[PDB]
Each structure stands twice: as structure tokens, then as C-alpha cells.
Design an enzyme around this catalytic site. Structure first.
Site, PDB file in Angstrom:
ATOM      1  N   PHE A  41       0.854  -1.226   0.000  1.00 17.12           N
ATOM      2  CA  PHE A  41       0.000   0.000   0.000  1.00 17.12           C
ATOM      3  C   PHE A  41       0.876   1.258   0.000  1.00 17.12           C
ATOM      4  O   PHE A  41       0.549   2.243  -0.711  1.00 17.12           O
ATOM      5  CB  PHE A  41      -0.933  -0.008   1.211  1.00 17.12           C
ATOM      6  CG  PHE A  41      -0.234  -0.140   2.545  1.00 17.12           C
ATOM      7  CD1 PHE A  41       0.296   0.974   3.193  1.00 17.12           C
ATOM      8  CD2 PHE A  41      -0.088  -1.382   3.150  1.00 17.12           C
ATOM      9  CE1 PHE A  41       0.940   0.846   4.412  1.00 17.12           C
ATOM     10  CE2 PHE A  41       0.548  -1.500   4.377  1.00 17.12           C
ATOM     11  CZ  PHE A  41       1.045  -0.386   5.010  1.00 17.12           C
ATOM     12  N   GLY A  42       1.959   1.211   0.768  1.00 15.21           N
ATOM     13  CA  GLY A  42       2.946   2.290   0.881  1.00 15.21           C
ATOM     14  C   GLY A  42       3.598   2.285   2.242  1.00 15.21           C
ATOM     15  O   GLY A  42       3.944   1.189   2.726  1.00 15.21           O
ATOM     16  N   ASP A 151      -9.716  -7.948   6.502  1.00 11.30           N
ATOM     17  CA  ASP A 151      -8.351  -8.194   7.043  1.00 11.30           C
ATOM     18  C   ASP A 151      -8.332  -8.059   8.574  1.00 11.30           C
ATOM     19  O   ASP A 151      -7.312  -7.614   9.100  1.00 11.30           O
ATOM     20  CB  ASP A 151      -7.333  -7.281   6.381  1.00 11.30           C
ATOM     21  CG  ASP A 151      -5.932  -7.801   6.491  1.00 11.30           C
ATOM     22  OD1 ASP A 151      -5.756  -9.050   6.651  1.00 11.30           O
ATOM     23  OD2 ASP A 151      -5.041  -6.997   6.405  1.00 11.30           O
TER      24      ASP A 151
HETATM   25  C1  LIG Z   1      -1.387  -0.814   7.846  1.00  4.01           C
HETATM   26  C2  LIG Z   1      -2.221  -0.491   6.792  1.00  4.01           C
HETATM   27  N1  LIG Z   1      -3.204   0.427   6.880  1.00  4.01           N
HETATM   28  C3  LIG Z   1      -3.364   1.039   8.066  1.00  4.01           C
HETATM   29  C4  LIG Z   1      -2.555   0.798   9.177  1.00  4.01           C
HETATM   30  C5  LIG Z   1      -2.629   1.661  10.363  1.00  4.01           C
HETATM   31  N2  LIG Z   1      -3.549   2.557  10.636  1.00  4.01           N
HETATM   32  C6  LIG Z   1      -3.120   3.143  11.827  1.00  4.01           C
HETATM   33  C7  LIG Z   1      -3.759   4.066  12.663  1.00  4.01           C
HETATM   34  C8  LIG Z   1      -3.224   4.375  13.875  1.00  4.01           C
HETATM   35  C9  LIG Z   1      -2.022   3.768  14.313  1.00  4.01           C
HETATM   36  N3  LIG Z   1      -1.555   4.052  15.566  1.00  4.01           N
HETATM   37  C10 LIG Z   1      -0.453   3.438  15.946  1.00  4.01           C
HETATM   38  C11 LIG Z   1       0.213   2.501  15.115  1.00  4.01           C
HETATM   39  N4  LIG Z   1       1.319   1.810  15.540  1.00  4.01           N
HETATM   40  C12 LIG Z   1       1.575   1.629  16.965  1.00  4.01           C
HETATM   41  C13 LIG Z   1       1.426   0.186  17.310  1.00  4.01           C
HETATM   42  O1  LIG Z   1       2.484  -0.596  16.756  1.00  4.01           O
HETATM   43  C14 LIG Z   1       2.881  -0.065  15.491  1.00  4.01           C
HETATM   44  C15 LIG Z   1       1.739   0.629  14.787  1.00  4.01           C
HETATM   45  N5  LIG Z   1      -0.238   2.232  13.894  1.00  4.01           N
HETATM   46  C16 LIG Z   1      -1.364   2.860  13.479  1.00  4.01           C
HETATM   47  C17 LIG Z   1      -1.933   2.546  12.218  1.00  4.01           C
HETATM   48  O2  LIG Z   1      -1.594   1.601  11.258  1.00  4.01           O
HETATM   49  C18 LIG Z   1      -1.558  -0.151   9.046  1.00  4.01           C
END
Ligand SMILES: c1cncc(-c2nc3ccc4ncc(N5CCOCC5)nc4c3o2)c1
Ligand SMILES: c1cncc(-c2nc3ccc4ncc(N5CCOCC5)nc4c3o2)c1
Lengths: 351, 351
Positions: A41-42, A151
Site C-alpha cells: 500500500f505504501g 483483514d
Molecule cells: C497498515 C495499513 N493500513 C493502516 C494501518 C494503520 N492505521 C493506523 C492508525 C493508527 C495507528 N496508531 C499506531 C500505530 N502503531 C503503533 C502500534 O504498533 C505499530 C503501529 N499504527 C497505526 C496505524 O496503522 C496499518
């Protein structure tokens, strides 16, 4: 607009549209930018909003100028205490990238579960209760719009360790499902992939997320993934080592138009003997009502919230282990109850 | 043409172009069709060729009529004792699918390694020697065309358990690399993903496969992945817990144009203490010469084949553990030796 501040910190200034409310672009400034994630995704970043000092995640994806962004459109509809808030979106650097600015949430259920499993212990059941109940709440919200996350997995369940608030995140595979319109089958993370998807079903339901949810509950009781498939079809092997071969009637309920896997007739392992000896039966029972082959036989998220496993949550005398009260678990809207309004009696104790 | 045979078996008949030899579409008939795999790409089947009774895999990918198939083009160029043969391709069912017909090979290196790790033992080093040597052979072949597999991992190392012959497979990520043409960075499976890829480098080389190969050697000695990253950037964490932070000069060698990861300065763990106590040092040494940050410092596949760790293979008196002689290890072509022809003296013992 890249600048420096009063203390010489590198400040980024961008023009961003509120995530919810009027399409009215304001200027937004953040600093302390660092990479906390990446995928197909990036990249995902941490930064700090200058004005308020609040922490955020920024998910930077590539945007086909011509294609409109599925994930953006869903994020903009959603407002719920157990889903991470889109605060703002904006665009940046001859290719165009979409940036989603979301509440930072310090921990996840994966990282918590691991701490325990690395020390050969299980999460106390009160943490499992709080987490699963809240997940089901989030799932009921989104399934009441026909949105299916696709997911559900512990790495996408954020939590604040002090409040025990759970926020669902990563809508990068989410999609409003439409009776008759086909859906990709290689979706969802292997371990949390519902069996019909492994059979190639393109006509599934938001009940795939309930399976995914069951796989997590199981994981939190077990201390490790229940169905640790090495590959997409080996997953099915692993599901079968517990549930046994399905009837032909089940295999139809999953995917009417299927293909030949031709596996040996294995018999269903008893549910209670899957888990460790002291495992609360209420938990094992709920587990069984989630991990059903026939997608229509799996509980609903609202149904799951109503399961006796979550009775302790509905006790007036309940507190977090750190002494603080439980986050708001009962303040259901109409949208949330739509699927089955009469369940309100159980889900909402008098207090 | 779906029919029944002399014994009433469901026979599929198709028009297929041989993989190697003249572009001359012949009729091919196979039976005993079953799904042994699936991914983003589609499904993988086993079937049995009627005429000869030989077993095959058939990888079914979706084909954009307008786009040409990278994987097909490469498969057709390749012919090596340690790469799985394309026997034939064909098309089938408003969408067009490409079907690749490949020699069936009963086992993989992943499934063998696990049998051992599940029983808390390590693969005997002679099996590690046989497998790694053959992989490097296959890598040297393909790198002598500027082809880079880009998904080296034990699940993609097929082996016949009786002969110990290794065939490299899944060229679904392979690509003839081109000086000045960028390459996607989110490639390769997490654990086997070279550091420069995690840094977003789009200007890498076929030296990423050497890294990947080092991660496998490591795995086979250890009994588990050396760099078990939970996420794309956490991978880098895990690599660093062993190698320590790289110098700034290294970080340039990997990606000159990078971005802010901002991680702690951790100190290099001693190599010998990573593995178990009886681990042959030759192995750990080779491992070190593969798992280097600076892509140009990593051994070459032909270099790797030469390494003293593989001296036991070059002993005249050497056999398989099952009593039988070793597979063809020495019959190098010119194409194979091109990168460094003088190595032939060591690689090709008198006998
Ligand atoms: C992969 C694809 N699309 C979205 C996500 C994602 N959305 C958020 C929102 C908020 C978040 N807040 C914290 C966070 N940390 C902290 C916890 O361990 C690493 C990720 N990660 C966040 C995050 O990751 C991940
Ligand atoms: C996914 C992406 N691209 C290619 C493939 C693939 N090619 C082969 C060739 C030959 C194969 N022979 C056997 C086999 N079994 C059985 C034993 O190993 C696991 C899968 N799998 C094979 C295979 O899979 C799969």
C-alpha cells in the site's frame, strides 16, 4: 511548505480536508515524522500535530489520478468509538499520493499477545473479554453498512493500554459487499482467512470477518494462532486438523462453484481438548459458535457481543485490572442495533 | 475437451506449446487434477499426463490480453538441472488465463526443515550443503542472464527426497534487471527481504537473491528464521539486532536517496553466538559473507558454490545418507562460469 519552528524543529505544513464534516480544506502542520510501517500500500508514519501536540498515524498510498479511492470513501462514512478516526486526508509528492491522517494508538493486540506468549503465559480472560467484545462492536457498526473489513487480525486491532479502548484500523482491504457482484478470494491474512476464501468463493459475506474474529479469540486463549497454515491451502489442512473434513452440504454453503482439493477424511477434534485445561467453557463455547464452516451458521457481531462470555463485562462491579472503570461499552446508537434491535435488552444492563 | 478414458477417469485435453523446443502447439491430455496451492496469481494444480503417467504442476494466472507475461518469457529462456522445467503452456477459461505446466517435485526445503524443527533437531549439515550449493548453482545460471528471482525462500526450493535434487520455482516475481530502469522495493517475502529493499531502494541488483539465500542457510542451521520481522520495517529491526546498525557508508551503498527511520544505535552481536555450539564454523563464515549490508560485498552465487563449506561435496568418496551417489553437481556449462571462468579449477574436482 517545509519550514523550521521557534525551536528549529522541521515542521511540515499541508492543505488537508477534514475526515468527517464539511469538505473544507484547512492548513495542517505536523513534525517528529518517522516510519512505523510499510506494505504493498505504501508507508505508515508517526508525526505530531503542532497546534495540539496530538500524535497521529499518516498512511501514504499511491493514487491512480483516474481511479477513486475505495478506502478513503469508507473512512469518510465511519464514526465509532472502536474504529480509528480519520482526522484529515491530503495529497503530496510525477506521481500523486493520498495521505490519511488518523489518531495514533500506542499498542496493538498482536504486540500485547506476544509479550505473554514469549513468556509462555496467556492474557487474562478479562483482557480477552474487553478486546473481543469491542471488536464485535466495531464489526456490527461496519456490517450495518454492508462494509466488510476483510483483514481482521491482531496487528490491525489497536489498543490504549490504560483505558483498554480497542480501535479497528487498516481499511485497505475493506469493501462494501453487493449481492451478485463478485469479490476477490485471495484476501485477508492467511491465519484469519475464512475457509470459503481458500475454496475460491467470489460470492461471500461480511461473515468472513466473524471467522477472522474467532481465529483471534482462539489465538488469545491458546497463546498462538489456532490455524498456523504455512501456505494458502495448507491453512485448510490446519482448519481440518481441528474441525475435521466438512460435509458436502457445508462445502456448498461456502462455494457452490468449487474445485477438487481431494483430502483424506479426518474426524473432528473435541473443542475442549484444543485449549488448555482451565480455559473458561463460556469462551470455548463462543469460539465454537464463531469457527463454523457454514458462513450463515457463524454468530453475527451483535449476537457475539450478547454471548455469556461477555456477562462479566455487564456486571456493575467490573473494573480494569489497574483500578479504572471500563470504557463506554453500552452506549449503542440505532445504526448499531439495526441488525437485531431486540438484543438491546441483554447488551444494555439497567446501570 | 473434457472426456472419459478406457478406465472412465476424467481426462482433460488441451492445445499446449512446448516450453522449450520449437513453437509447435500439440494436443496434451492429463487427469487426476487437484489444487495443491493458490495466491494473488491464481491456483496451482497437480495432474498426471495420460501418455507417460508423469506428474506435473499447472500454475493458472490471469492474462491481460494486452499485457505480455514476464514469467512466461523467462521460463522459456531457462533450462537448468536445478530449475523446474516448463514442459508446456496453454490458455483456458470473459477472461483469459495462462496455464504453466511444470515438472511435479514431491517435497520442498521448507517442509523438510520444519519436520526437524518441530522435533527440536537441526537438519544434518550434509543436507544444508547439498541444498544451499544447488540453490547457488541455480542463482548463478539465472544471474548470468541478468534475471533476478526476487522471491528466494525455502517454500520455493522444491526437492526429490531420494536424489536430493533441488529445483528453484515460482518465477512470479522474477525480472531481467536493466541499469537505469527502477524496480519495485516492496518485493520478496519479509524474512528473506534484503535491507536495501526495506529502505525503498528501486535501484538494486541480483545481489538481493544472495541475501535471501543467506537468510535460508541461516534458517537451516538455526531451525527457525534468523530475521523474524513482524512487519516491513520491524524486519530491519531484527536484521540490526544481529548485524548492528550499519555505517553511513553502507546505508549509501544500499540506497543513496532514503528517508527517516530514526532507530537506536545497537551494537553487532558476535556471529558464533547467533548459532548453536556444534555449528560448523565454515557455515557461519559463509553465512557472514552472504548477510552483508553492502550489496557489492555479498559473495556471488558462483563464489558461494566455491566456499570451503561445500568442500565435503567435492570429496570423491561422498554419498547421500541413503547410500546412493550425489546428484550432478559438477557439470557446469560456460554460461554458468561466465561471471568468473577461472573458479572452474575449484568447482570441478579432477574426478
Ligand atoms: C497498515 C495499513 N493500513 C493502516 C494501518 C494503520 N492505521 C493506523 C492508525 C493508527 C495507528 N496508531 C499506531 C500505530 N502503531 C503503533 C502500534 O504498533 C505499530 C503501529 N499504527 C497505526 C496505524 O496503522 C496499518
Ligand atoms: C506458486 C507460485 N509459482 C509457482 C508455483 C509452483 N511451481 C511448482 C512446480 C512444481 C511443484 N511441485 C510440487 C509442488 N507442491 C508439492 C510439494 O511442495 C509443495 C507444493 N508445488 C510445485 C510448484 O508450485 C507455486
Amino acid at each position: 511548505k517545509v519550514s523550521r519552528d521557534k525551536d528549529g524543529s522541521k515542521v511540515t505544513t499541508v492543505v488537508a480536508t477534514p475526515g468527517q464534516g464539511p469538505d473544507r480544506p484547512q492548513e495542517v502542520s505536523y513534525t517528529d515524522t518517522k516510519v512505523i510501517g510499510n506494505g504493498s500500500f505504501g508507508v505508515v508514519y508517526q508525526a505530531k500535530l503542532c497546534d495540539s501536540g496530538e500524535l497521529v498515524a499518516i498512511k501514504k498510498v499511491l493514487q491512480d489520478k483516474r481511479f477513486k479511492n475505495r478506502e478513503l470513501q469508507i473512512m469518510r462514512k465511519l464514526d465509532h468509538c472502536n474504529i480509528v478516526r480519520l482526522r484529515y486526508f491530503f495529497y503530496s509528492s510525477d506521481e500523486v499520493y493520498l495521505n490519511l491522517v488518523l489518531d495514533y494508538v500506542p499498542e496493538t493486540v498482536y504486540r500485547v499477545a506476544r509479550h505473554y506468549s514469549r513468556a509462555k503465559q496467556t492474557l487474562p480472560v478479562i483482557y480477552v473479554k474487553l478486546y473481543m467484545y469491542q471488536l464485535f462492536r466495531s464489526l456490527a457498526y461496519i456490517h450495518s453498512f454492508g462494509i466488510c473489513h476483510r483483514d481482521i487480525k491482531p496487528q490491525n486491532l489497536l489498543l490504549d493500554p490504560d483505558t483498554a479502548v480497542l480501535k479497528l484500523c487498516d481499511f485497505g482491504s475493506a469493501k462494501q459487499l453487493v449481492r451478485g457482484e463478485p469479490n476477490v478470494s485471495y484476501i485477508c491474512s492467511r491465519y484469519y482467512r475464512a475457509p470459503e476464501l481458500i475454496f475460491g468463493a467470489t460470492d461471500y459475506t461480511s461473515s468472513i470477518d466473524v471467522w477472522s474474529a474467532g481465529c483471534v479469540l482462539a489465538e488469545l486463549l491458546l497463546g498462538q494462532p489456532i490455524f498456523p497454515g504455512d501456505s494458502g491451502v495448507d491453512q485448510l489442512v490446519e482448519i481440518i486438523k481441528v474441525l475435521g473434513t466438512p460435509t458436502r452440504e457445508q462445502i456448498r454453503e461456502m462455494n457452490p462453484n468449487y474445485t477438487e482439493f481431494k483430502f483424506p477424511q479426518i474426524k473432528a477434534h473435541p473443542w475442549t481438548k484444543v485449549f488448555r485445561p482451565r480455559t473458561p467453557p463460556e469462551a470455548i463455547a463462543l469460539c465454537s459458535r464463531l469457527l463454523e464452516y457454514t458462513p450463515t451458521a457463524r454468530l453475527t457481531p451483535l449476537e457475539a457481543c450478547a454471548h455469556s462470555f461477555f456477562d462479566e463485562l455487564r456486571d456493575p462491579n467490573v473494573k480494569l485490572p489497574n483500578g479504572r472503570d471500563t470504557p463506554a461499552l453500552f452506549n449503542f446508537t440505532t445504526q448499531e442495533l439495526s441488525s437485531n434491535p431486540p438484543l438491546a435488552t441483554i447488551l444494555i444492563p439497567p446501570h
